[PDB]
Amino acid sequence: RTQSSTGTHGGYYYSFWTDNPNTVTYTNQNAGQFSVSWSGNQGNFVGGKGWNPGAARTIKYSGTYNPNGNSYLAVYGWTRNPLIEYYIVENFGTYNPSSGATAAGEVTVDGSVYDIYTSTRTNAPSIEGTRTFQQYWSVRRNKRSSGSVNTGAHFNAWSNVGLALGSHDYQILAVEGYYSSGSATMTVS
């Protein structure tokens, strides 16, 4: 049992996905606001609001993020030609989502140092189907649940490590959970 929901709401692109619809509730609210509540330490989900296509934009977000276990809060998006999946992790719970990726330096932006990582996913699900694509990570050391993200500064930093970003696909502020519980209300702009 899986459920994936995308579209435009309040003037913003939204995307929600889970393999357990009964333990996660995603709620579209006005403008770029969305809420997600998950319980029972069962299921995997990713949801949030943003843009399609993304861009080198300044993403402003604010709200409340209350994970209890494996969960992360991140700007999350894709590019095409080349195929790239990227994460700007602003906060996370008991697991660093970067684990397993290769260290690739630091970048200081938006009031904190971010640790950069790169990784390759081999014959894995992607926005274009099963592909081999590159991953870029920026993990904030000073975890926060509100502020501004200069995406261009990470796009520039990543381009000095490996292949440069291609044409943008979707770009959202995502709340994620993996067999955990929590609640979150965020508003992007």
Residue numbers in the entry: 5 to 193
Task: Provide passages from the article that reported this PDB entry.
In the case of N. haematococca xylanase (GH11) the crystal symmetry does not change with crystal size. The structural models resulting from refinement against the RT-SSX datasets are the first RT datasets of this N. haematococca xylanase. To inspect fluctuations in data quality and indexing rates, the run was split into 40 independent datasets, each consisting of 1000 detector images, and processed with the CrystFEL pipeline separately. Next, 1000, 2000, 3000, 4000, 5000, 6000, 8000, 10 000, 15 000, 20 000, 30 000 and finally all 40 000 detector images were processed together with partialator to assess the number of indexed images needed for a full dataset. Going from 1000 images to 40 000 images, the resolution at which CC* reaches 0.5 (the typical cut-off level in macromolecular crystallography) goes from 1.83 Å down to 1.5 Å [see Fig. 4(a)]. The alignment of all the residues of the active site (S19, W21, Y76, Y80, E89, Y91, P101, R125, Q139, Y174, E180 and Y182) is slightly worse, with an all-atom RMSD of 0.519 Å and comparable with the all-atom RMSD of all the residues (0.583 Å). The same alignment carried out using the 1000-image dataset, instead of the 40k dataset, resulted in a slightly worse all-atom RMSD of 0.630 Å. For just the two catalytic residues E89 and E180, the all-atom RMSD is 0.151 Å, overall the residues in the active site align very well in all three cases. At the same time, the TapeDrive system allows for uninterrupted data collection without manual intervention or the need to enter the hutch, enabling future automated multi-parameter data collection for multidimensional serial crystallography. This was demonstrated by collecting 40 datasets in less than 30 min, wherein each dataset had good statistics and usable diffraction to a resolution of better than 2 Å and each dataset took 40 s to collect with a PILATUS 6M detector, corresponding to only 7.5 s using an EIGER 16M (Dectris, Switzerland) at 133 Hz. If a higher resolution is desired, longer data collection times improve resolution, i.e. recording more indexable detector images, with a sweet spot, in this case, at roughly 4000 images.
Serial crystallography at conventional synchrotron light sources (SSX) offers the possibility to routinely collect data at room temperature using micrometre-sized crystals of biological macromolecules. We show here the versatility of this setup and methodology by performing structural studies at room temperature (RT) of three additional enzyme systems of biological relevance: (i) Klebsiella pneumoniae CTX-M-14 β-lactamase, a β-lactamase relevant to multi-antibiotic resistance mechanisms; (ii) Nectria haematococca xylanase GH11, a highly active xylanase suitable for industrial applications; and (iii) Aspergillus flavus urate oxidase (UOX) in the presence of the long-lived intermediate-like 5-per­oxy-9-methyl-isourate (5PMUA).
